[PDB]
Amino acid sequence: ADPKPMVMWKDLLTGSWKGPDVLITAGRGYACVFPQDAESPIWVPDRFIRPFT
């Protein structure tokens, strides 16, 4: 069931923190988020995500 797990994540191109957005997967140094207004999922290093409960 929902809600999906949510994270804040850093946009490394603008430097700004984004979210909270649904976390798709995370591990081995990476994390995938999929904002509702994104064309496709977003991948960032997992040192740049923060859980948001």
Side-chain angles (χ1 to χ4, degrees), residues 1-46:
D2 72 289
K4 309 279 205 66
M6 309 294 282
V7 296
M8 305 293 297
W9 57 277
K10 192 174 179 174
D11 182 327
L12 275 54
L13 182 51
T14 74
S16 65
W17 285 88
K18 300 294 184 69
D21 289 296
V22 160
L23 181 64
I24 300 305
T25 182
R28 294 296 193 193
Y30 292 90
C32 175
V33 306
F34 200 2
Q36 186 63 18
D37 60 338
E39 295 173 347
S40 63
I42 294 168
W43 286 92
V44 301
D46 68 352

